Design a protein around this ligand. Structure first.
Ligand SMILES: CCCCCCCCCCCCCCCCCC(=O)OC[C@H](COP(=O)([O-])OCC(O)COP(=O)([O-])OC[C@@H](COC(=O)CCCCCCCCCCCCCCCCC)OC(=O)CCCCCCCCCCCCCCCCC)OC(=O)CCCCCCCCCCCCCCCCC
Ligand SMILES: CCCCCCCCCCCCCCCCCC(=O)OC[C@H](COP(=O)([O-])OCC(O)COP(=O)([O-])OC[C@@H](COC(=O)CCCCCCCCCCCCCCCCC)OC(=O)CCCCCCCCCCCCCCCCC)OC(=O)CCCCCCCCCCCCCCCCC
Ligand SMILES: CCCCCCCCCCCCCCCCCC(=O)O[C@@H](COC(=O)CCCCCCCCCCCCCCC)COP(=O)(O)OCC[N+](C)(C)C
Ligand SMILES: CCCCCCCCCCCCCCCCCC(=O)O[C@@H](COC(=O)CCCCCCCCCCCCCCC)COP(=O)(O)OCC[N+](C)(C)C
Ligand SMILES: CCCCCCCCCCCCCCCCCCCC(=O)O[C@H](COC(=O)CCCCCCCCCCCCCC)COP(=O)(O)OCCN
Ligand SMILES: CCCCCCCCCCCCCCCCCCCC(=O)O[C@H](COC(=O)CCCCCCCCCCCCCC)COP(=O)(O)OCCN
Ligand SMILES: CCCCCCCCCCCCCCCCCCCC(=O)O[C@H](COC(=O)CCCCCCCCCCCCCC)COP(=O)(O)OCCN
Ligand SMILES: CCCCCCCCCCCCCCCCCCCC(=O)O[C@H](COC(=O)CCCCCCCCCCCCCC)COP(=O)(O)OCCN
Ligand SMILES: CCCCCCCCCCCC(=O)SCCNC(=O)CCNC(=O)[C@H](O)C(C)(C)COP(=O)(O)O
Lengths: 52, 83, 82, 58, 111, 77, 127, 147, 120, 97, 536
């Protein structure tokens, strides 16, 4: 639930601030969610989870 | 060309004569440099002069092992590039 | 003799790790029974779910895939302990 | 929270460790091989060099 | 200890029972070295020694991704110059956000 | 089978021994040095690119300034 | 004797090989060499790259001193005590076309400015 | 050293085979070597390919293999016509002004005047005149230079 | 000084310095005529310090002479052509016997030469 | 080692071959052996010279057919002896010869 | 008639390299020199027809060598006055070298293959020189490049020789890549590859820089001179051909054929190359290396003269053709000296009884190199120095280069002849046959004819200069010669060491460029395709 909340909140906040519907909102929300996924994880994972 | 011992002996004896300290009869086909009266720095010069005489390059570690009239002749005979 | 891959770890330690998979094996009907029942009721409830955005659906699928634990993983690591 | 990340075989550590002992090819020996990193040095105009090279009459 | 296997006349027979070793194609095979074989094995299976380090990520990004970014920027600049040269309207390229639909020039039109 | 690992010592006395070895570690340039030298040499390779960029920017800036002065002259007049 | 000279054979490898042993070039004769001499190992004359850079730092100002004066400090009027070669008008007009010509520096001419701007021509083709 | 008999023009000192070609040993009595199974088939097939390629490249009528060969006479006639027309264009300055107006509407520069004379019979001009993109003055200008 | 020179005993180390110095006199000269006076000068330079017995001073002289011999290494060593580092070394190396030559290669199993696809 | 039977078919060491130099005599190379000097070399050289001159004749015909002089030479040129397409010479002043 | 010379050279190449088994070592020793002699007669006829009598000819072998859409190129030969002169010089030198190799290469296994390489090498030079369009020039350019690769690395069992050949190949590859870029530029904006329609009065700077970068490769200028010194690994006949005519001159010939160069770049680069080549030749102790650095210096003079005046192209070509002769003589005599003494180092050479012809040829070639008055080299070099006075920066550097050239030339002469014998007491000998005498007679005839016939039409045309300015090069050369005879020290040991390392251009490449090249290779392969993208 926490991961999904970060994803949805960041998506809506970026779309409101940008004012446009774009790919970038989803990429940024996913990047934040993957960053939260890999807070204390070993080295490849800080890169791979934001990307996925 | 494998050069025979007799010629190599003659030329090494010829080179050894040029040191002033060495007396012309002390040099024999089998004599160490010490009995001839040669020092270490002199042995350097004799090894180099052997290098001009037979037109060869003595690698240094073998150059250390040359301390006698005998083994110098042996080394020259061993060399196939000796002239 | 041929060049071969180096195998990390000691032979007996690796064999001991592999031997932790030799545990009492439950029969799969117990899992299947519950999955069938809750799946039938789940399919009945899904027709009443609200329509979700495709983006949210894909993120939910990703989270479910990441959170899914293979049955072998629980098998090796299960301890009958508090 | 058990997750795939725990059981994915992440390349954090080398599977194969190279052998320590390694072959160094034979090379002709240079007796004195210290590098000259100074274009201007006292060594060029050293008294020994002057006596050995520059001074003797030719 | 050796014998001639090949016969030009056509009367060739392989003497599998012959005491003498035939001079067959294996006669000229290279002897091979144990350490060279292990070097070949190591070099082919270099993925075993691959490790994700910040230095590795730095190298991969800076050279590979850097060259891709530089090439894409140069190609975009060349496309812009060619559009100015040809007299075409700014073309709607894929990642360029342009409010023009010009993609393919009309041959019939004079630009 | 395999080639012999025993060397030939017949010519050591003539041409020197093989005892002396290389001092190289057989390792490559450091990542930091490599970054500097790639990002220096590769631009030097691409010298036409920067010439074209410079002239195109000059042409576009002159054209825009001409357009601005033209607008100024065509506004009052 | 050019042909048939004795040679030393390089010893066979007897230890695990380094990963970058391809940097060493060995044909079987004893003195193997790096792929590019000076990349590693003994340096010719025991001179490092720092030494060569310092030597070049010493040389460049002296070598560049003759060139910098004429190219930068000097000007067309004061470079030489004479004007460029004088030609008939028909010949001069054709010769002035060449961007790499030598009549573009004739400051006596009334087309000097245009000739100088022609000399400092385009870096790249516009089209 | 020197030459073997002291004379440069003396018979060679080497008798026998300098080497074994393909690695094959000469037969003792001079018996010919048995030919390989593929030799006849290989020679016939590949020689047939190359001979057919030669014959088709050279035997075939113009325009059958090389299309440009067909265009060579037509280009000669077109070259003559274009020569006459460009010569007429240089002489008449009234036509130059009219073609100047035609060029500007076609987004072409004045130096492209020879080009327009050379694209009289082409898809672009021929269809643009029909559609209205090309001014109808170009037809009259072309005719005034003998088409 | 290289590691091999350092590992050498004192007597042999001074001998190496004298040998390398003489060779570098040969390399830096323009002819044989220059060699003799310079060789005598090197002779006297070594003879001057031979009777010193203070170890620390002797170490200083050896180290300084080794630095001097390192700096004055010639870019172009004068090496006899037939030896390692020489022009004619390896031009046409004498080819050894016992060469593995396969006679009549194409006539060994001529019809069945080729690669086969073996399957289970 | 007792020389193999095929050594009889192989040729000897040539006069130009150094006595110390050893080469494998079985190796075949199109440019020749290590020191060559084959028997019958004189006839082969004569044949090569004949082929060279015949090819020179063919090339001479081809070149003369395709040699185009579009500007008159200033003076007489040797090509006038063999090719008839040479323009009549005109000197520096402009007079025809 | 014009085609015949290329036919003769390529026939010699094919005959010796493919049927040399039948011909033999003697068969090469006849068919090579005879064919090049016939080619020399043909080249003499060409020179008389084109240069003296002003009759250019075009021979189109066949059309549509490449015919793809508008791109159309044909195999055609145009013998213009530049081409006839270069053809004559090249064929004369190559006939001499073929006469030379009969005795020099007798102790070499593949003498037939060597002759075949030499003849195809000359043939590709003549293809480059006589081409009517850029593509034929590129064909000859790459042909001489590959022939140099197969000739420098002739001794395959030497790691140094094969690495030298690889060096030459790679550097020349970069240079012709730049040339191919310039070729594409010129085809696009001029409509053709032929030199006639190639003419542009104004050209954008990029084309000029590409042409110059391509030219500085073969004509080894600065940053591209590394291969010339290493090219000494090859046999002496190779060095004479590559340094005299075939490889080094090609860049100058390209720059003269198409006057798209810029005055500012060529003069600075040439003067820098001349000074650096002289300074490098000062330190060198091999006989063969000094002559290569002198070749570099002369190339620097020729490149510099293009900036001076409109006649600079003519002056450069005149110095080119004059230089080929005495430089080829210098290499051939040096090679004979090495064979007689079994040595390559200048220290151990000395006075010894020899042939009067060889010593005289060495003396006269070195005098031409120095600038001795009333000689062919003297006129072709004073034409450059006197006309470079207007470019003050260029003139100064060229005058110092003349001083350095005189110094090392006189030092080499004193060390080879005047100095006492320096080699050992061993039986060493190289007896010279009449063929080598005919070779040196041909070179000496070229040198003598150069004086009477001249190098350029404006060679003796007045440069309106004060007498003390005009005769200055002679005084500088004389001072350099006198200082060289005394064997005085000119620079400190640090700068002598710097020059012995040739400026450290190669050490920079080693430590930075090659290491970056192989680190890029490491990232591309080990980290990425056999790393990140390879499964366990
Ligand atoms: C109290 C009862 C207990 C159950 C409670 C629930 C009861 C059921 C209630 C309702 C059931 C209906 C809905 C449940 C899901 C349907 C599955 C099912 O019922 O089949 C019967 C199944 C048993 O069948 P089985 O034949 O015995 O087992 C077969 C396996 O081999 C089993 O053997 P195994 O476990 O040993 O092997 C597992 C294997 C089996 O493979 C699978 O699991 C396949 C799943 C793939 C996705 C499935 C399709 C997704 C589409 C969803 C559609 C909705 C969204 C629409 C839009 C989405 C667009 C994609 O997968 C793996 O190896 C582990 C990875 C798991 C996902 C793999 C994909 C990874 C992608 C992520 C990439 C990131 C990595 C990057 C870095 C990598 C570095 C190199 O029962 C269950 O598993 C139900 C468990 C419920 C947990 C699911 C949690 C999330 C559910 C929703 C998320 C959807 C994603 C699916 C996740 C995995 C589900 C299996
Ligand atoms: C350019 C910039 C420089 C590139 C490198 C910069 C750092 C890279 C950072 C990424 C990284 O660290 O990768 C390591 C990581 C591998 O982990 P590991 O530590 O090496 O070991 C774990 C395995 O056990 C390893 O065990 P293994 O050894 O057995 O597996 C080896 C495997 C391991 O490889 C992989 O697992 C993935 C390989 C492809 C990665 C995709 C691109 C990722 C990087 C591109 C962006 C980088 C910018 C930063 O390699 C392969 O054999 C597969 C490669 C064969 C296919 C080649 C296709 C190439 C496609 C793109 C190439 C990558 C770009 C470089 C060249 C560019 C050319 C245009 O790769 C990933 O996790 C992939 C992350 C990105 C995946 C793309 C997004 C996935 C989409 C998921 C959507 C979710 C759907 C939801 C529904 C789910 C229900 C079904
Ligand atoms: C332009 C129209 C006329 C074309 C004539 C071209 C001139 C001759 C062309 C003959 C065919 C060219 C390709 C020949 C095969 C390439 C291999 C080769 O040339 O040499 C072979 C072997 O040579 C041959 O057997 C055949 C060569 C016959 C004549 C070769 C003439 C030179 C080749 C011309 C360059 C090709 C141009 C390609 C680019 C334009 C290997 O030589 P190395 O590597 O040096 O080793 C030899 C051994 N040793 C170490 C002792 C030196
Ligand atoms: C800045 C460049 C401006 C000038 C560029 C021209 C020269 C560029 C570098 C020249 C390298 C070519 C030389 C070469 O072939 O290298 C090796 C060949 O070995 C190699 O393959 C090494 C690879 C080097 C080639 C490429 C490295 C330089 C690349 C330039 C830029 C790097 C990246 C740029 C973007 C790709 C041979 O050298 P030596 O060992 O000295 O042999 C000489 C003979 N002797 C033994 C007697 C000393
Ligand atoms: C199968 C495709 C999956 C992508 C694989 C890429 C490699 C995976 C690495 C993970 C990285 C996250 C995915 C990012 C990919 C998007 C490309 C970035 C380009 C970009 O940022 O522009 C956006 C549009 O591109 C877009 O977002 C849409 C572009 C679609 C992606 C490229 C599709 C073809 C790629 C196939 C390569 C080969 C397949 C093998 C994987 C912004 O646009 P905007 O509208 O927001 O404007 C901004 C106004 N705020
Ligand atoms: C995670 C992976 C990635 C992480 C690491 C990435 C780090 C790399 C970033 C730097 C890459 C090199 C620089 C290129 C991008 C510059 C910034 C892009 C913006 C841009 O397009 O500006 C143009 C750059 O100039 C240009 O057109 C390009 C000039 C540089 C190319 C030449 C230098 C290298 C030459 C080597 C050959 C490669 C190219 C071969 C064709 C000039 O602006 P504009 O006037 O065009 O207007 C366009 C309006 N933004
Ligand atoms: C006459 C026309 C011009 C002819 C050529 C002139 C070239 C002039 C360039 C050299 C002058 C400026 C040099 C930069 C100042 C550096 C001074 C100190 C040098 C230093 O400390 O580091 C060096 C860096 O290499 C370097 O310094 C490389 C910088 C060179 C820049 C590239 C220019 C091309 C140079 C080609 C010939 C010059 C050869 C000598 C540079 C040695 O580095 P290291 O190996 O000790 O590093 C350690 C490995 N971890
Ligand atoms: C006496 C016997 C002598 C034996 C040795 C001589 C061998 C034959 C030499 C002369 C024959 C030349 C033909 C070679 C292929 C030429 C193809 C060709 O140029 O014509 C194309 C035919 O279209 C096509 O579609 C052709 C299709 C087949 C082409 C060959 C495909 C490659 C086959 C394998 C290579 C073997 C080649 C031999 C169209 O030409 P164009 O429209 O572009 O205009 C031409 C301007 N460039
Ligand atoms: C090209 C430029 C050339 C460079 C030349 C630079 C060379 C530097 C020369 C000066 C360095 C020195 O003096 S290094 C001198 C170091 N001093 C000593 O070692 C004192 C102790 N001497 C002894 O033990 C023996 O006498 C011994 C001498 C070993 C012989 O043994 P013998 O009694 O059995 O002959």
């Amino acid at each position: 639930t926490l991961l999904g909340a970060i994803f949805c909140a960041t998506d809506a906040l970026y779309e409101n601030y940008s004012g446009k519907k774009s790919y970038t909102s989803g990429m940024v929300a996913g990047a934040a969610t993957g960053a939260v996924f890999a807070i204390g994880r070993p080295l490849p994972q800080p890169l791979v989870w934001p990307l996925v | 060309h494998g050069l025979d011992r007799d010629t190599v002996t003659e030329r090494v004896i010829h080179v050894a004569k040029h040191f002033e300290k060495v007396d012309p009869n002390k040099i024999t086909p089998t004599a160490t440099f010490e009995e001839l009266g040669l020092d270490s720095l002199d042995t350097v010069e004799l090894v180099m002069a052997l290098e001009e005489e037979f037109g060869l390059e003595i690698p240094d570690n073998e150059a250390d092992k040359i301390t006698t009239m005998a083994d110098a002749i042996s080394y020259v005979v061993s060399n196939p590039l000796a002239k | 003799d041929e060049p071969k891959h180096q195998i990390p770890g000691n032979a007996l330690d690796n064999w001991a790790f592999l031997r932790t998979y030799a545990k009492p094996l439950p029969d799969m009907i117990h899992y299947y029974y519950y999955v069938y029942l809750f799946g039938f009721f789940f399919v009945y409830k899904v027709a009443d779910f609200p329509e979700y955005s495709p983006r949210v659906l894909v993120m939910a699928a990703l989270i479910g895939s990441l959170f899914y634990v293979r049955r072998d993983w629980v098998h090796r690591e299960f301890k009958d302990s508090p | 929270v058990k997750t795939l990340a725990d059981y994915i075989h992440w390349r954090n550590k080398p599977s194969s460790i190279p052998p320590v002992d390694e072959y160094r090819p034979p090379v002709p020996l240079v007796n004195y091989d210290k590098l000259s990193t100074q274009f201007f040095s006292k060594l060029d105009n050293d008294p020994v060099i002057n006596r050995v090279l520059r001074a003797p009459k030719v | 200890s050796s014998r001639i296997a090949g016969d030009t006349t056509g009367k060739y027979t392989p003497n599998i029972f012959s005491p003498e070793t035939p001079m067959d194609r294996s006669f000229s095979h290279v002897p091979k070295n144990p350490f060279w074989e292990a070097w070949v094995f190591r070099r082919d299976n270099i993925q075993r020694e691959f490790v994700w380090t910040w230095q590795t990520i730095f190298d991969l990004a800076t050279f590979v991704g850097g060259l891709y970014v530089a090439m894409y920027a140069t190609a975009s600049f060349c496309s812009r110059q060619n559009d100015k040269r040809n007299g075409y309207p700014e073309r709607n390229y894929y990642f360029s956000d342009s409010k023009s639909n010009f993609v393919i020039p009309d041959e019939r039109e004079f630009y | 089978n395999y080639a012999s690992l025993k060397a030939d010592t017949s010519m050591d006395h003539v041409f020197g021994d093989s005892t002396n070895k290389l001092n190289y570690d057989f390792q490559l340039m450091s990542s930091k040095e490599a970054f500097f030298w790639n990002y220096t040499l590769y631009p030097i390779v691409g010298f036409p690119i920067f010439l074209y960029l410079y002239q195109f920017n000059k042409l576009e800036n002159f054209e825009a300034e001409i357009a601005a002065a033209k607008a100024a002259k065509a506004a009052s007049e | 004797a050019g042909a048939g000279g004795p040679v030393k054979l390089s010893p066979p490898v007897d230890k695990p090989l380094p990963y970058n042993y391809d940097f060493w070039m060995d044909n079987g004769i004893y003195p193997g060499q790096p792929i590019y001499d000076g990349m590693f190992g003994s340096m010719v004359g025991n001179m490092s790259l720092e030494y060569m850079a310092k030597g070049w730092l010493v040389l460049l100002p002296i070598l560049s001193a003759p060139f910098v004066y004429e190219h930068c400090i000097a000007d067309d009027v004061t470079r030489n005590p004479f004007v460029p070669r004088q030609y008939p008008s028909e010949v001069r007009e054709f010769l002035a076309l060449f961007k790499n010509g030598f009549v573009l520096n004739d400051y006596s001419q009334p087309d000097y400015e245009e000739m100088k701007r022609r000399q400092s021509g385009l870096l790249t083709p516009i089209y | 050293s020197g030459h073997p008999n002291g004379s440069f023009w003396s018979e060679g000192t080497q008798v026998g085979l300098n080497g074994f070609k393909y690695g094959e040993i000469p037969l003792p009595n001079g018996q010919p070597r048995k030919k390989l199974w593929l030799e006849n088939i290989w020679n016939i097939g590949y020689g047939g390919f190359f001979l057919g390629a030669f014959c088709l490249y050279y035997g075939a009528p113009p325009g059958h293999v090389i299309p440009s060969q067909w265009a060579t006479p037509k280009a000669k006639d077109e070259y003559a016509v274009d020569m006459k027309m460009i010569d007429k264009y240089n002489e008449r300055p009234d036509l130059q002004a009219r073609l100047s107006i035609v060029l500007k509407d076609l987004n072409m520069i004045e130096e492209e005047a020879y080009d327009l004379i050379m694209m009289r019979k082409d898809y672009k001009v021929l269809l643009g005149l029909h559609s209205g993109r090309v001014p109808a003055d170009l037809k009259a200008i072309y005719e005034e230079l003998e088409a | 000084a290289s590691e091999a020179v350092l590992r050498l005993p004192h007597k042999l180390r001074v001998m190496r310095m004298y040998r390398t110095g003489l060779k570098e006199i040969v390399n830096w000269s323009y002819g044989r005529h220059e060699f003799y006076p310079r060789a005598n000068a090197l002779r006297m330079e070594f003879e001057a310090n031979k009777e010193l017995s203070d170890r620390e001073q002797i170490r200083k002289l050896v180290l300084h002479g080794e630095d001097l011999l390192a700096r004055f290494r010639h870019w172009e060593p004068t090496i006899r052509s037939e030896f390692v580092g020489g022009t004619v070394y390896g031009v046409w190396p004498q080819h050894c016997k016992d060469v593995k030559f396969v006679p009549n290669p194409a006539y060994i199993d001529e019809f069945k030469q080729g690669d086969t696809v073996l399957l289970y | 080692v007792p020389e193999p039977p095929y050594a009889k078919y192989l040729a000897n060491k040539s006069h130009y071959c150094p006595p110390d130099f050893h080469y494998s005599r079985e190796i075949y190379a199109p440019y020749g052996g290590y020191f060559n000097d084959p028997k019958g070399w004189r006839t082969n050289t004569a044949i090569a010279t004949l082929v060279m001159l015949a090819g020179a004749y063919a090339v001479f015909c081809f070149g003369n057919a395709r040699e185009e002089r579009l500007r008159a030479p200033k003076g007489w040129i040797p090509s006038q002896l063999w090719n008839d397409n040479v323009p009549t010479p005109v000197d520096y002043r402009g007079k025809v010869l | 008639m014009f085609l015949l010379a290329v036919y003769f050279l390529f026939f010699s190449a094919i005959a010796n390299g493919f049927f040399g088994r039948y011909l033999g070592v003697r068969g090469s020793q006849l068919l090579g020199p005879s064919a090049l002699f016939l080619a020399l007669l043909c080249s003499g006829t060409i020179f008389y027809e084109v240069c003296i009598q002003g009759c250019s000819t075009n021979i189109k072998l066949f059309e549509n060598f490449v015919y793809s859409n508008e791109l159309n190129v044909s195999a055609s030969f145009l013998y213009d006055p530049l081409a006839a002169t270069m053809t004559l010089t090249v064929v004369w030198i190559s006939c001499a070298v073929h006469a030379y190799q009969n005795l020099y290469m007798r102790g070499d296994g593949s003498q037939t293959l060597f002759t075949s390489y030499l003849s195809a090498f000359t043939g590709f030079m003549l293809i480059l020189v006589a081409g009517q369009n850029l593509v034929m020039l590129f064909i000859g350019w790459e042909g001489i490049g590959v022939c140099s690769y197969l000739l420098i690395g002739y001794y395959g069992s030497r790691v140094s020789a094969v690495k030298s050949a690889n060096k030459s190949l790679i550097v020349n590859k970069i240079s012709d890549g730049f040339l191919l870029g310039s070729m594409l530029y010129l085809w696009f904006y001029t409509g053709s590859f032929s030199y006639c329609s190639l003419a542009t009065f104004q050209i954008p700077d990029v084309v000029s820089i590409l042409v110059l970068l391509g030219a500085i490769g073969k004509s080894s200028q600065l940053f591209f001179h590394v291969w010339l010194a290493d090219a000494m690994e090859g046999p002496t006949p190779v060095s004479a051909l590559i340094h005299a005519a075939t490889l080094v001159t090609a860049g100058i010939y390209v720059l003269c054929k198409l006057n798209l160069h810029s005055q500012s770049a060529v003069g600075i680069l040439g003067a820098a190359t001349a000074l650096m080549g002289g300074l490098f030749g000062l330190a060198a102790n091999d006989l063969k290396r000094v002559i290569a650095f002198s070749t570099c210096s002369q190339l620097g003079y020729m490149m510099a003269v293009l900036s001076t005046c409109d006649d600079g192209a003519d002056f450069a070509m005149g110095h080119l053709v004059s230089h080929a002769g005495f430089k080829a003589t210098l290499f051939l005599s040096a090679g004979l000296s090495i064979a007689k003494e079994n040595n390559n180092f200048l220290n151990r050479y000395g006075s010894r009884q020899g042939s009067p012809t060889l010593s005289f040829a060495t003396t006269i070639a070195s005098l031409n190199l120095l600038g001795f008055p009333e000689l062919g080299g003297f006129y072709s070099k004073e034409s450059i120095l006197n006309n470079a006075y207007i470019n003050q920066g260029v003139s100064i550097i060229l005058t110092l280069a003349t001083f350095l050239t005189a110094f090392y030339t006189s030092k080499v002469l004193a060390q080879l002849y005047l100095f006492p014998y320096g080699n050992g007491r061993q039986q060493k000998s190289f007896d010279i046959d009449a063929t080598t005498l005919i070779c040196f007679g041909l070179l000496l005839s070229e040198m003598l004819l150069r004086i009477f016939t001249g190098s350029s039409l404006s060679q003796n045309m007045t440069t309106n200069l004060p007498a003390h300015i005009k005769n200055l090069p002679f005084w500088v050369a004389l001072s350099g010669a006198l200082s060289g005879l005394a064997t005085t020290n000119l620079f400190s040991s640090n700068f002598m060491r710097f020059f012995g390392n040739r400026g450290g251009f190669d050490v920079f490449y080693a430590r930075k460029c090659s290491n970056v090249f192989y680190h890029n290779a490491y990232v591309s392969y080990t980290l990425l395709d056999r790393g990140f993208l390879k499964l366990y």
